[PDB]
Amino acid sequence: TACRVCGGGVQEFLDLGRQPLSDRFRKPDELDDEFTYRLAVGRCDSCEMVQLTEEVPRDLMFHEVYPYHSSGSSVMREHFAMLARDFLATELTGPDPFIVEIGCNDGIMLRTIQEAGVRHLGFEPSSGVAAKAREKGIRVRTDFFEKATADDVRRTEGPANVIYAANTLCNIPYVQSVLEGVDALLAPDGVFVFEDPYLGDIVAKTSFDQIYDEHFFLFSATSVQGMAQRCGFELVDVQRLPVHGGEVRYTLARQGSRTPSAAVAQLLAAEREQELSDMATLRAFAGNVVKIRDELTALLHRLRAEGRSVVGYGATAKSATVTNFCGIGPDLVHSVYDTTPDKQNRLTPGAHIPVRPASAFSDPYPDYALLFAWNHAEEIMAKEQEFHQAGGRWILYVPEVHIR
Ligand SMILES: Cc1cn([C@H]2C[C@H](O)[C@@H](COP(=O)(O)OP(=O)(O)O[C@@H]3C[C@](C)(N)C(=O)[C@@H](C)O3)O2)c(=O)[nH]c1=O
Ligand SMILES: Nc1ncnc2c1ncn2[C@@H]1O[C@H](CSCC[C@H](N)C(=O)O)[C@@H](O)[C@H]1O
Ligand SMILES: [Zn+2]
Numbered sequence: 001t002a003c004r005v006c007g008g009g010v011q012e013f014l015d016l017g018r019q020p021l022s023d024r025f026r027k028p029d030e031l032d033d034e035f036t037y038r039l040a041v042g043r044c045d046s047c048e049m050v051q052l053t054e055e056v057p058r059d060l061m062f063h064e065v066y067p068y069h070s071s072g073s074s075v076m077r078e079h080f081a082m083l084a085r086d087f088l089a090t091e092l093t094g095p096d097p098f099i100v101e102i103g104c105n106d107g108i109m110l111r112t113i114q115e116a117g118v119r120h121l122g123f124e125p126s127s128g129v130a131a132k133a134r135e136k137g138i139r140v141r142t143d144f145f146e147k148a149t150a151d152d153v154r155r156t157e158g159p160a161n162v163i164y165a166a167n168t169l170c171n172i173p174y175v176q177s178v179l180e181g182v183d184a185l186l187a188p189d190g191v192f193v194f195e196d197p198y199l200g201d202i203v204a205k206t207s208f209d210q211i212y213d214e215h216f217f218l219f220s221a222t223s224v225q226g227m228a229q230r231c232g233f234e235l236v237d238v239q240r241l242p243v244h245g246g247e248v249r250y251t252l253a254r255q256g257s258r259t260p261s262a263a264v265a266q267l268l269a270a271e272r273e274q275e276l277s278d279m280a281t282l283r284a285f286a287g288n289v290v291k292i293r294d295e296l297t298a299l300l301h302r303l304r305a306e307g308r309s310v311v312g313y314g315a316t317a318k319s320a321t322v323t324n325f326c327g328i329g330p331d332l333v334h335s336v337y338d339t340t341p342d343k344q345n346r347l348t349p350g351a352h353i354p355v356r357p358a359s360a361f362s363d364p365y366p367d368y369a370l371l372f373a374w375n376h377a378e379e380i381m382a383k384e385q386e387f388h389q390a391g392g393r394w395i396l397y398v399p400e401v402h403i404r
Contacts, residue, residue, distance in 0.1 A: 001042065001091045001113065003044035003046065003047060003049055003051065004044075004049075004051060004173045004174070004175060004176070004216075005042060005044065005047050005051075005175060005176070005223075005226070005227050005230070006046050006047040006049070006215075006226070006227075006230060006354070007046075007200075008044040008045045008046030008047055009044070009045040010042035010043065010044050010045070010051065010053060011043055011045060011279065012040050012042040012053055013041060013042060013043065013279065013282040013285075013286050014039065014041045014211070014282075014285070014286040014289060014299075015038070015039075015040040016039040016041075016145050016208070016211060016321060016324075016325050017038070017039065017154045017324070017325060018036045018038060018039075018324070018348065019036060019037060019038075019145070019212065019320060019321060019324050019325075019395065020034045020035065020036055020038070020212060020320060020324065020349035020350035021034065021035050021056070021060060021142060021213055021320075021349060022212040022213050022317035022318070022320035022321070022349060023061065023067055023068060023213075023214065023271065023317050023349075024075040024296050024349050025067060025315070025342070025343045025346035025347065025348065025355060026346060026347050026349070026352070026362060027345075027346055027347070028345075028346070028347055028354070030347075031048050031313065032352070033088050034107065034349060034350065035056075035060060036350075037054050037056055037213065038053070038054050039052065039053065039054070039211065039212065039213070039321065040054065040098045041053070041211055041218070041403045042103075042264050043277060043279060043282060044223075045306070047223060047224070047226040047227065047230070048220070048222050048223045048226060048277045049217065049219075049223040049269060050175075050199055050218040050220070050223065050277065050282070051216055051217050051218070052173075052216050055173045055182060055216065056213045057321065058125075058144060058172075058212075061171075061213060061214055062125050062126045062144075063125075063126060063127075063265075064126070064127045064128055064222045064333075065126075065128055065342070066126035066128065066129060067340060067342045067343050068105070068317065068340075069105070069127070069129060069132070070105040070106050070108040070129075070212065070338055071105075071106045071107075071108050071132075071338060072339055073376055073379060074379060075376070075378075075379050076108060076243065076245065077108060079241075079243055080108045080109040080112070080166070081109075081111075081112045082181065083109060083164075083166075083309065084109050084110075084112030084113050084116075084154060086220060087099065087113075087162055087164070088112075088113070088115060088116050088143070090116065090190060091161055091190065092113075092118055092161055092162060094161060094334060096161065097118055097119065097121065097161045097162075098118075098119045098120065098121075098157060098158065098160045098161055099113055099118060099119075099120045099121075099160060099162040099163075099164065100120070100121050100123070100145075100153065100160045100162070100164070100381045101121075101122045101123065101163075101164050101165065102119070102161045102163065102164070102165035102168050102169065102178070102194075102323045102361050103123065103124065103125075103145075103166065103167065103168030103171075104122030104123065104130075104138065104140060105124060105129050105133065105164055105185045106124065106129045106132040106133055106136075107132065107133030107134075107136045107138045107140075107215075109139060109164070110122050110133065110138045111133075111136045111137075113138075114136065114138050114139075119157075119246065120138070120139055121139050121140070121141060121142055121153060121157065121225045122138055122139065122140040122141070123140075123143060123144065123145040123149070123197060124140050124141070125142060125143055125144045126142075127142045128342075130142045130247075138377040141153075145178060145181055146174060146177040146178060146181055147177045147178075147180040147181045147184065149181070150178075150180070150181030150182065150185040151181075151184050151185075153185060154184050154185045159185065159186065159188075159190065160185050160186055160187060160190060161188035161189075161191075162190060162191055162192075162193060163182055163185060163186055163190070163191075163192045164192075164193050164194070164195070165192075165193075165194040165195075166194070166195050166196075167195070167196060167197075167244065168194070168196075169194040169196055169217070170196035170197065170216060170218070170219060171214045171215060171216060171319075172216065173216045173217075174288050175217070175227070175392060176231075179227075179231045179233070180231075182233075182252075183231065183232065185321075186254075188254060188257070189253075189254075189257060190253075191236075191251050191252065191253050192233065192251075192252040192253075193250070193251050193252070194249070194250055194252075195239075195241060195247045195248065195249035195250070196215075196219050196248075197210045197215065197218065197244055197245060197246065197247055197304040198216070198218075198219070198220070198240065198246050198247050199218045199219065199220040199223075199276060199277065200220065200246070200248075200274075200276055201245060201246025201247070202218055202245075202246070202285070203276065203282070203285045204244075204246075204399070205246065205398050205399040206247065206285065206288040206289060206292055206399055206400070207245050207246075207398045208285075208289040208292070208321065208325075208397070209316070209318035209321045209322050209372075209379065209398075210245060210318060211321060212317055212320055212321045213317075213320075214319060215310075217251065218250065220246065220269050220271055220276060221235065221238055221250070221264065221267040221268050221271055222268060222276070222277055222279055223273070223277070224248075224250045224252075225264070225268065228252045229255070232254065232255050233252040233253065233254060234253055234255045234256065234257075234258070235250060235251070235252055235254060235260065235261065235264050236251050236252065236258045236259070236260045236261065236264065237249075237250075237251035237260070237261045237263060238250060238251070238261075238263050238264050238267045239251075239263070240267075243375070244375050245374075245375045245398070248267075260290050276351065281398075287338050292397055292400070292401060293325060294399075295397075295401040296322075296326055296328075296397045297326050297327065297328065297393075298403050299395065299401055299403075300328060300332045300333065300370075300395075301332065303332075303367075303368060304331075304332060308367040308368060309334065309366040309367045309368065310332060310333050310334065310366060310367065310368045310369075310370060310395070311335045311336065311337060311361070311366045311368070311370070312333045312335070312336040312337070312353065312369065312370040312371075312372050312382070313333055313337050313338075313339075313358075313361070313370065313371050313372060313373060313380065313384075314336070314338060314371065314372040314373025314374075314376065315334070315336045315338035315340065315343045315348060315355045315372070316372045316373050318372065318388050319336070319348065319372040320348065320349045320350060320351075321352065322372065322397070323348060323350060323351035324349075324350040324351060327353060328385045329351040329352060329353060330351075330352065330353045330354065333353055333359075333370055334353070334354075335353065335354050335355070335356050335367075336348060336353050336354070336355045336356070336372065337356055337357070337358045337360060337361040337369075338355050338356075338357070338358060339357070341357075342354060343355050344357045351357050361384065362386075362388065363386070363390065363402065365386075365387050365390050365391075366390040366392060367391075367392060367393070368392065368393055368394075368395050368403070369387070369392060369393075369394055369395065370395040370397075371394045371395065371396050374396050374397075374398050377394075379397075
Protein backbone atom coordinates (compact mmCIF):
# COMPACT_ATOMS: atom_id res chain seq x y z
CA THR A 1 0.00 0.00 0.00
CA ALA A 2 1.11 3.60 -0.75
CA CYS A 3 1.41 6.08 2.17
CA ARG A 4 -1.50 8.57 2.14
CA VAL A 5 0.87 11.31 3.26
CA CYS A 6 3.93 11.03 1.00
CA GLY A 7 3.39 8.02 -1.31
CA GLY A 8 6.18 6.01 0.35
CA GLY A 9 5.96 2.29 0.96
CA VAL A 10 3.99 1.11 4.01
CA GLN A 11 5.13 -1.98 5.88
CA GLU A 12 2.59 -3.91 7.96
CA PHE A 13 3.31 -4.84 11.54
CA LEU A 14 -0.07 -5.81 13.03
CA ASP A 15 -2.99 -7.69 11.49
CA LEU A 16 -6.22 -7.58 13.49
CA GLY A 17 -8.20 -9.66 11.04
CA ARG A 18 -11.67 -9.13 9.61
CA GLN A 19 -13.63 -6.40 11.50
CA PRO A 20 -17.15 -4.86 11.17
CA LEU A 21 -17.93 -1.12 11.09
CA SER A 22 -17.21 -0.16 14.75
CA ASP A 23 -20.07 2.29 15.10
CA ARG A 24 -22.85 0.20 13.49
CA PHE A 25 -25.29 -1.05 16.20
CA ARG A 26 -27.95 -3.44 14.79
CA LYS A 27 -31.43 -4.14 16.09
CA PRO A 28 -31.70 -7.70 17.41
CA ASP A 29 -33.97 -8.83 14.55
CA GLU A 30 -31.77 -7.43 11.76
CA LEU A 31 -30.24 -9.83 9.29
CA ASP A 32 -26.81 -10.95 10.38
CA ASP A 33 -25.03 -9.38 7.39
CA GLU A 34 -22.38 -6.77 8.06
CA PHE A 35 -19.80 -4.85 6.07
CA THR A 36 -16.35 -6.17 6.96
CA TYR A 37 -12.85 -5.11 5.95
CA ARG A 38 -9.33 -6.19 6.90
CA LEU A 39 -7.95 -4.15 9.78
CA ALA A 40 -4.12 -4.04 9.65
CA VAL A 41 -1.56 -1.37 10.52
CA GLY A 42 1.74 -0.44 8.86
CA ARG A 43 4.41 2.28 8.93
CA CYS A 44 5.51 4.40 5.95
CA ASP A 45 9.19 3.82 4.99
CA SER A 46 9.82 7.44 4.09
CA CYS A 47 7.88 9.65 6.51
CA GLU A 48 7.30 7.31 9.50
CA MET A 49 3.54 7.73 9.42
CA VAL A 50 1.76 4.75 11.03
CA GLN A 51 -1.56 4.09 9.23
CA LEU A 52 -4.11 1.40 8.33
CA THR A 53 -3.65 -0.61 5.11
CA GLU A 54 -7.32 -0.70 4.05
CA GLU A 55 -9.51 2.42 4.00
CA VAL A 56 -13.22 2.17 4.85
CA PRO A 57 -15.18 4.55 2.65
CA ARG A 58 -16.13 7.67 4.58
CA ASP A 59 -19.86 7.45 3.89
CA LEU A 60 -20.07 3.98 5.44
CA MET A 61 -18.81 5.35 8.79
CA PHE A 62 -20.12 8.90 8.88
CA HIS A 63 -23.73 9.59 7.89
CA GLU A 64 -27.14 10.39 9.19
CA VAL A 65 -27.26 7.88 12.07
CA TYR A 66 -23.66 7.94 13.28
CA PRO A 67 -24.16 7.30 17.00
CA TYR A 68 -21.25 8.79 18.91
CA HIS A 69 -22.29 11.70 21.09
CA SER A 70 -19.26 13.62 22.39
CA SER A 71 -21.24 15.31 25.13
CA GLY A 72 -21.87 12.00 26.90
CA SER A 73 -18.75 12.52 29.07
CA SER A 74 -18.45 15.23 31.75
CA VAL A 75 -14.64 15.10 31.59
CA MET A 76 -14.71 15.75 27.85
CA ARG A 77 -17.25 18.56 28.17
CA GLU A 78 -14.91 20.34 30.59
CA HIS A 79 -11.83 19.54 28.50
CA PHE A 80 -13.32 21.12 25.38
CA ALA A 81 -14.77 24.17 27.13
CA MET A 82 -11.32 24.88 28.57
CA LEU A 83 -9.73 24.52 25.14
CA ALA A 84 -12.32 26.95 23.73
CA ARG A 85 -11.60 29.51 26.47
CA ASP A 86 -7.87 29.17 25.76
CA PHE A 87 -8.46 29.95 22.08
CA LEU A 88 -10.74 32.93 22.93
CA ALA A 89 -7.93 34.28 25.12
CA THR A 90 -5.08 33.86 22.62
CA GLU A 91 -5.72 33.25 18.92
CA LEU A 92 -9.24 34.73 18.68
CA THR A 93 -8.62 38.16 20.18
CA GLY A 94 -8.77 40.04 16.89
CA PRO A 95 -11.46 42.46 15.71
CA ASP A 96 -13.37 39.89 13.68
CA PRO A 97 -12.01 36.45 14.55
CA PHE A 98 -13.21 33.24 12.86
CA ILE A 99 -12.83 29.64 14.03
CA VAL A 100 -13.68 26.52 12.05
CA GLU A 101 -13.98 23.12 13.69
CA ILE A 102 -13.59 19.89 11.73
CA GLY A 103 -15.83 17.24 13.32
CA CYS A 104 -17.86 19.35 15.72
CA ASN A 105 -20.20 16.46 16.59
CA ASP A 106 -22.90 17.58 19.04
CA GLY A 107 -21.18 20.96 19.55
CA ILE A 108 -19.12 19.99 22.64
CA MET A 109 -16.46 22.60 21.82
CA LEU A 110 -18.18 25.18 19.64
CA ARG A 111 -20.98 25.93 22.14
CA THR A 112 -18.38 27.88 24.16
CA ILE A 113 -17.32 29.82 21.05
CA GLN A 114 -20.98 30.54 20.17
CA GLU A 115 -21.61 31.68 23.75
CA ALA A 116 -18.72 34.15 23.39
CA GLY A 117 -20.34 35.65 20.26
CA VAL A 118 -17.39 34.63 18.05
CA ARG A 119 -17.95 33.87 14.34
CA HIS A 120 -17.55 30.13 13.75
CA LEU A 121 -18.42 27.18 11.59
CA GLY A 122 -18.57 23.45 12.42
CA PHE A 123 -18.12 20.79 9.73
CA GLU A 124 -20.12 17.79 10.77
CA PRO A 125 -21.00 15.39 7.95
CA SER A 126 -23.02 13.13 10.31
CA SER A 127 -26.35 14.91 10.26
CA GLY A 128 -28.00 13.54 13.42
CA VAL A 129 -25.26 14.87 15.69
CA ALA A 130 -24.97 18.03 13.51
CA ALA A 131 -28.62 18.78 14.35
CA LYS A 132 -27.86 18.45 18.08
CA ALA A 133 -25.15 21.13 17.64
CA ARG A 134 -27.51 23.35 15.62
CA GLU A 135 -30.11 23.09 18.43
CA LYS A 136 -27.50 24.78 20.67
CA GLY A 137 -27.31 27.70 18.19
CA ILE A 138 -24.00 26.63 16.64
CA ARG A 139 -23.44 27.24 12.89
CA VAL A 140 -22.80 23.87 11.25
CA ARG A 141 -22.33 22.66 7.69
CA THR A 142 -23.30 19.02 7.17
CA ASP A 143 -20.36 18.28 4.84
CA PHE A 144 -16.93 16.74 5.10
CA PHE A 145 -14.10 19.20 5.36
CA GLU A 146 -11.79 18.75 2.34
CA LYS A 147 -10.14 21.01 -0.29
CA ALA A 148 -13.34 21.98 -2.10
CA THR A 149 -15.54 22.64 0.90
CA ALA A 150 -12.68 24.63 2.52
CA ASP A 151 -12.45 26.71 -0.69
CA ASP A 152 -16.20 27.36 -0.52
CA VAL A 153 -16.01 28.57 3.08
CA ARG A 154 -13.00 30.78 2.25
CA ARG A 155 -14.89 32.37 -0.63
CA THR A 156 -17.95 33.21 1.50
CA GLU A 157 -16.56 33.71 5.01
CA GLY A 158 -12.90 34.76 4.60
CA PRO A 159 -9.81 33.35 6.40
CA ALA A 160 -10.08 31.40 9.68
CA ASN A 161 -7.80 32.37 12.51
CA VAL A 162 -8.03 28.84 13.97
CA ILE A 163 -8.94 25.55 12.36
CA TYR A 164 -9.35 22.90 15.08
CA ALA A 165 -10.00 19.15 14.95
CA ALA A 166 -10.24 16.71 17.88
CA ASN A 167 -10.47 12.89 17.42
CA THR A 168 -11.25 13.64 13.71
CA LEU A 169 -8.04 14.21 11.74
CA CYS A 170 -6.74 10.71 12.47
CA ASN A 171 -9.98 9.37 10.94
CA ILE A 172 -9.33 10.98 7.51
CA PRO A 173 -7.16 9.12 5.00
CA TYR A 174 -7.44 12.06 2.55
CA VAL A 175 -5.35 14.19 4.90
CA GLN A 176 -3.60 15.79 1.92
CA SER A 177 -6.97 17.21 0.75
CA VAL A 178 -7.63 18.43 4.30
CA LEU A 179 -4.20 20.13 4.35
CA GLU A 180 -4.92 21.76 1.00
CA GLY A 181 -8.17 22.87 2.62
CA VAL A 182 -6.28 24.30 5.55
CA ASP A 183 -3.85 26.09 3.21
CA ALA A 184 -6.78 27.70 1.34
CA LEU A 185 -8.70 28.69 4.47
CA LEU A 186 -6.24 29.52 7.26
CA ALA A 187 -5.17 33.11 7.88
CA PRO A 188 -1.53 33.79 7.10
CA ASP A 189 -0.88 34.05 10.86
CA GLY A 190 -3.32 31.42 12.07
CA VAL A 191 -2.97 27.92 13.46
CA PHE A 192 -4.31 24.49 12.55
CA VAL A 193 -4.53 22.62 15.86
CA PHE A 194 -5.56 18.94 16.14
CA GLU A 195 -5.51 16.36 18.94
CA ASP A 196 -5.71 12.59 18.44
CA PRO A 197 -4.54 9.34 20.07
CA TYR A 198 -0.81 9.35 20.43
CA LEU A 199 1.36 6.50 19.04
CA GLY A 200 3.60 6.84 22.16
CA ASP A 201 0.77 6.06 24.51
CA ILE A 202 -0.60 3.23 22.35
CA VAL A 203 2.76 1.51 22.33
CA ALA A 204 3.35 2.02 26.04
CA LYS A 205 -0.10 0.84 27.12
CA THR A 206 -0.59 -1.80 24.39
CA SER A 207 -3.96 -0.08 23.88
CA PHE A 208 -4.69 -1.81 20.52
CA ASP A 209 -8.39 -1.05 20.83
CA GLN A 210 -7.43 2.45 19.68
CA ILE A 211 -7.04 0.78 16.25
CA TYR A 212 -10.37 0.44 14.37
CA ASP A 213 -12.05 1.65 11.18
CA GLU A 214 -12.30 5.31 12.24
CA HIS A 215 -8.67 5.59 13.32
CA PHE A 216 -6.69 5.61 10.07
CA PHE A 217 -3.56 7.33 11.41
CA LEU A 218 -1.75 6.84 14.71
CA PHE A 219 0.09 10.18 14.78
CA SER A 220 3.45 10.89 16.42
CA ALA A 221 5.40 14.16 16.65
CA THR A 222 7.92 12.69 14.20
CA SER A 223 5.31 11.91 11.55
CA VAL A 224 3.23 15.02 12.06
CA GLN A 225 6.37 17.16 11.76
CA GLY A 226 7.12 15.49 8.41
CA MET A 227 3.55 15.82 7.20
CA ALA A 228 3.45 19.52 8.09
CA GLN A 229 6.77 20.32 6.50
CA ARG A 230 5.89 18.55 3.25
CA CYS A 231 2.81 20.83 2.94
CA GLY A 232 4.34 24.20 3.80
CA PHE A 233 3.44 24.11 7.50
CA GLU A 234 5.53 23.64 10.61
CA LEU A 235 4.86 21.89 13.89
CA VAL A 236 5.23 24.75 16.38
CA ASP A 237 3.79 23.27 19.56
CA VAL A 238 2.96 19.90 21.14
CA GLN A 239 0.98 19.18 24.28
CA ARG A 240 0.33 15.75 25.79
CA LEU A 241 -3.24 15.16 27.02
CA PRO A 242 -4.67 12.37 29.27
CA VAL A 243 -8.02 12.09 27.50
CA HIS A 244 -8.87 9.13 25.30
CA GLY A 245 -6.06 7.00 26.65
CA GLY A 246 -3.34 9.53 25.83
CA GLU A 247 -3.17 12.10 23.07
CA VAL A 248 -0.97 14.79 21.70
CA ARG A 249 -2.33 18.15 20.61
CA TYR A 250 -0.32 19.37 17.64
CA THR A 251 -0.13 23.08 16.62
CA LEU A 252 0.75 23.72 12.97
CA ALA A 253 1.53 27.20 11.55
CA ARG A 254 2.65 28.35 8.15
CA GLN A 255 6.33 27.59 7.80
CA GLY A 256 8.64 30.06 9.57
CA SER A 257 5.79 32.24 10.73
CA ARG A 258 6.28 31.23 14.38
CA THR A 259 9.18 29.78 16.31
CA PRO A 260 8.66 26.25 17.59
CA SER A 261 8.37 25.82 21.37
CA ALA A 262 11.07 23.83 23.12
CA ALA A 263 8.41 21.16 23.62
CA VAL A 264 8.51 20.15 19.92
CA ALA A 265 12.23 19.42 19.90
CA GLN A 266 12.00 17.69 23.28
CA LEU A 267 9.24 15.31 22.20
CA LEU A 268 11.02 14.59 18.88
CA ALA A 269 14.17 13.71 20.86
CA ALA A 270 12.30 11.44 23.31
CA GLU A 271 10.62 9.57 20.42
CA ARG A 272 13.98 9.14 18.67
CA GLU A 273 15.64 8.07 21.94
CA GLN A 274 12.95 5.54 22.74
CA GLU A 275 12.82 4.29 19.11
CA LEU A 276 9.05 4.86 19.09
CA SER A 277 8.53 4.45 15.34
CA ASP A 278 11.30 1.89 14.62
CA MET A 279 9.78 -1.22 13.02
CA ALA A 280 11.19 -3.40 15.79
CA THR A 281 9.40 -1.40 18.46
CA LEU A 282 6.17 -1.62 16.51
CA ARG A 283 6.44 -5.41 16.08
CA ALA A 284 7.11 -5.77 19.80
CA PHE A 285 3.84 -3.88 20.37
CA ALA A 286 2.08 -6.30 17.95
CA GLY A 287 3.38 -9.24 19.96
CA ASN A 288 2.11 -7.61 23.19
CA VAL A 289 -1.25 -7.28 21.55
CA VAL A 290 -1.45 -11.05 21.04
CA LYS A 291 -0.40 -11.65 24.67
CA ILE A 292 -3.25 -9.40 25.91
CA ARG A 293 -5.78 -11.29 23.67
CA ASP A 294 -4.64 -14.63 24.98
CA GLU A 295 -4.78 -13.54 28.68
CA LEU A 296 -8.13 -11.81 28.31
CA THR A 297 -9.82 -14.84 26.68
CA ALA A 298 -8.22 -17.18 29.25
CA LEU A 299 -9.62 -15.02 32.05
CA LEU A 300 -13.08 -14.69 30.54
CA HIS A 301 -13.31 -18.47 30.08
CA ARG A 302 -12.06 -19.22 33.60
CA LEU A 303 -14.70 -16.81 34.99
CA ARG A 304 -17.39 -18.68 33.09
CA ALA A 305 -16.16 -22.11 34.33
CA GLU A 306 -16.26 -20.74 37.88
CA GLY A 307 -19.90 -19.59 37.56
CA ARG A 308 -19.11 -15.86 37.75
CA SER A 309 -21.23 -13.45 35.72
CA VAL A 310 -19.54 -11.00 33.42
CA VAL A 311 -20.83 -7.94 31.54
CA GLY A 312 -19.14 -5.06 29.72
CA TYR A 313 -19.25 -1.36 30.43
CA GLY A 314 -19.27 1.20 27.62
CA ALA A 315 -20.30 0.33 24.01
CA THR A 316 -17.18 2.01 22.70
CA ALA A 317 -16.21 1.94 19.00
CA LYS A 318 -12.88 0.65 20.35
CA SER A 319 -14.60 -2.44 21.78
CA ALA A 320 -15.38 -3.74 18.30
CA THR A 321 -11.66 -4.44 17.88
CA VAL A 322 -11.52 -6.22 21.18
CA THR A 323 -14.59 -8.43 20.75
CA ASN A 324 -13.88 -9.31 17.11
CA PHE A 325 -10.10 -9.84 17.42
CA CYS A 326 -10.49 -11.82 20.65
CA GLY A 327 -13.68 -13.70 19.72
CA ILE A 328 -15.69 -12.49 22.75
CA GLY A 329 -19.44 -12.64 22.45
CA PRO A 330 -22.56 -12.91 24.53
CA ASP A 331 -21.43 -16.44 25.68
CA LEU A 332 -18.75 -14.75 27.76
CA VAL A 333 -19.94 -11.18 28.33
CA HIS A 334 -23.71 -11.17 28.46
CA SER A 335 -24.53 -7.48 28.05
CA VAL A 336 -22.83 -4.15 27.52
CA TYR A 337 -24.11 -1.13 29.53
CA ASP A 338 -24.04 2.25 27.78
CA THR A 339 -25.52 5.76 28.22
CA THR A 340 -26.18 6.44 24.48
CA PRO A 341 -29.85 6.04 23.57
CA ASP A 342 -29.13 5.17 19.97
CA LYS A 343 -26.87 2.27 20.99
CA GLN A 344 -29.31 0.87 23.58
CA ASN A 345 -31.59 -2.07 22.72
CA ARG A 346 -29.21 -2.96 19.89
CA LEU A 347 -26.37 -5.45 19.39
CA THR A 348 -22.66 -4.65 19.25
CA PRO A 349 -20.95 -5.01 15.84
CA GLY A 350 -19.59 -8.37 14.76
CA ALA A 351 -19.93 -9.98 18.20
CA HIS A 352 -23.64 -9.09 18.69
CA ILE A 353 -23.60 -8.51 22.45
CA PRO A 354 -26.85 -6.84 23.67
CA VAL A 355 -26.41 -3.20 24.67
CA ARG A 356 -28.59 -2.02 27.54
CA PRO A 357 -28.98 1.41 29.24
CA ALA A 358 -26.44 2.10 32.04
CA SER A 359 -29.42 2.68 34.28
CA ALA A 360 -29.83 -1.17 34.11
CA PHE A 361 -26.44 -1.77 35.75
CA SER A 362 -27.82 -1.92 39.28
CA ASP A 363 -28.53 -4.23 42.24
CA PRO A 364 -28.36 -7.24 41.70
CA TYR A 365 -24.96 -6.59 40.12
CA PRO A 366 -22.96 -8.99 37.97
CA ASP A 367 -19.76 -10.32 39.53
CA TYR A 368 -17.51 -8.64 36.93
CA ALA A 369 -17.63 -5.77 34.48
CA LEU A 370 -15.20 -5.68 31.54
CA LEU A 371 -14.36 -2.00 31.19
CA PHE A 372 -14.44 -1.15 27.52
CA ALA A 373 -14.61 2.60 28.26
CA TRP A 374 -11.34 2.36 30.26
CA ASN A 375 -10.38 5.82 29.00
CA HIS A 376 -13.34 7.02 31.10
CA ALA A 377 -12.43 4.94 34.18
CA GLU A 378 -12.47 7.68 36.76
CA GLU A 379 -15.73 9.26 35.55
CA ILE A 380 -17.46 5.90 35.30
CA MET A 381 -16.20 4.39 38.57
CA ALA A 382 -17.24 7.53 40.40
CA LYS A 383 -20.83 7.02 39.25
CA GLU A 384 -20.69 3.28 39.99
CA GLN A 385 -19.36 3.21 43.56
CA GLU A 386 -22.24 1.01 44.71
CA PHE A 387 -21.25 -1.75 42.26
CA HIS A 388 -17.71 -1.88 43.72
CA GLN A 389 -19.01 -1.60 47.29
CA ALA A 390 -21.34 -4.56 46.66
CA GLY A 391 -18.18 -6.51 45.70
CA GLY A 392 -18.39 -6.25 41.92
CA ARG A 393 -15.02 -5.93 40.24
CA TRP A 394 -13.70 -4.31 37.03
CA ILE A 395 -11.80 -6.26 34.41
CA LEU A 396 -9.30 -4.05 32.54
CA TYR A 397 -7.05 -5.03 29.67
CA VAL A 398 -5.02 -1.81 29.42
CA PRO A 399 -2.08 -1.72 30.04
CA GLU A 400 -2.35 -5.46 30.98
CA VAL A 401 -5.20 -7.77 31.96
CA HIS A 402 -6.02 -7.23 35.63
CA ILE A 403 -8.98 -7.05 37.96
CA ARG A 404 -9.61 -4.48 40.62
C1 LIG B 1 -18.20 8.67 30.13
C2 LIG B 1 -19.19 7.54 29.91
C3 LIG B 1 -19.36 6.86 28.71
N1 LIG B 1 -20.23 5.85 28.46
C4 LIG B 1 -20.33 5.22 27.13
C5 LIG B 1 -20.70 6.28 26.09
C6 LIG B 1 -19.95 5.90 24.83
O1 LIG B 1 -20.76 5.01 24.02
C7 LIG B 1 -18.79 5.07 25.38
C8 LIG B 1 -17.46 5.77 25.56
O2 LIG B 1 -16.97 5.99 24.24
P1 LIG B 1 -15.58 6.78 24.00
O3 LIG B 1 -14.51 6.07 24.80
O4 LIG B 1 -15.74 8.28 24.32
O5 LIG B 1 -15.37 6.77 22.40
P2 LIG B 1 -15.26 5.50 21.41
O6 LIG B 1 -14.31 4.43 21.84
O7 LIG B 1 -16.68 5.03 21.14
O8 LIG B 1 -14.76 6.30 20.13
C9 LIG B 1 -15.65 7.29 19.59
C10 LIG B 1 -15.65 7.14 18.05
C11 LIG B 1 -14.46 8.05 17.68
C12 LIG B 1 -15.11 9.40 17.33
N2 LIG B 1 -13.74 7.49 16.52
C13 LIG B 1 -13.41 8.42 18.73
O9 LIG B 1 -12.20 8.45 18.55
C14 LIG B 1 -13.83 8.84 20.09
C15 LIG B 1 -13.66 10.31 20.49
O10 LIG B 1 -15.23 8.58 20.07
O11 LIG B 1 -19.05 4.73 26.73
C16 LIG B 1 -21.07 5.46 29.43
O12 LIG B 1 -21.85 4.50 29.26
N3 LIG B 1 -20.93 6.01 30.68
C17 LIG B 1 -20.13 7.07 30.96
O13 LIG B 1 -20.12 7.53 32.11
N1 LIG C 1 -13.80 15.21 6.66
C1 LIG C 1 -14.47 15.46 7.80
N2 LIG C 1 -14.80 16.70 8.20
C2 LIG C 1 -15.47 17.03 9.32
N3 LIG C 1 -15.92 16.15 10.20
C3 LIG C 1 -15.67 14.83 9.91
C4 LIG C 1 -14.94 14.41 8.71
N4 LIG C 1 -14.90 13.04 8.72
C5 LIG C 1 -15.54 12.66 9.85
N5 LIG C 1 -16.03 13.70 10.53
C6 LIG C 1 -16.73 13.72 11.85
O1 LIG C 1 -15.68 13.49 12.81
C7 LIG C 1 -16.39 13.24 14.04
C8 LIG C 1 -15.46 12.31 14.84
S1 LIG C 1 -16.19 12.04 16.44
C9 LIG C 1 -15.19 13.18 17.36
C10 LIG C 1 -16.05 14.36 17.78
C11 LIG C 1 -15.49 15.43 18.69
N6 LIG C 1 -14.59 16.44 18.06
C12 LIG C 1 -14.79 14.81 19.88
O2 LIG C 1 -13.56 14.95 19.95
O3 LIG C 1 -15.43 14.17 20.70
C13 LIG C 1 -17.66 12.50 13.65
O4 LIG C 1 -18.79 13.21 14.18
C14 LIG C 1 -17.66 12.54 12.13
O5 LIG C 1 -18.93 12.73 11.52
ZN1 LIG D 1 4.83 8.52 4.12
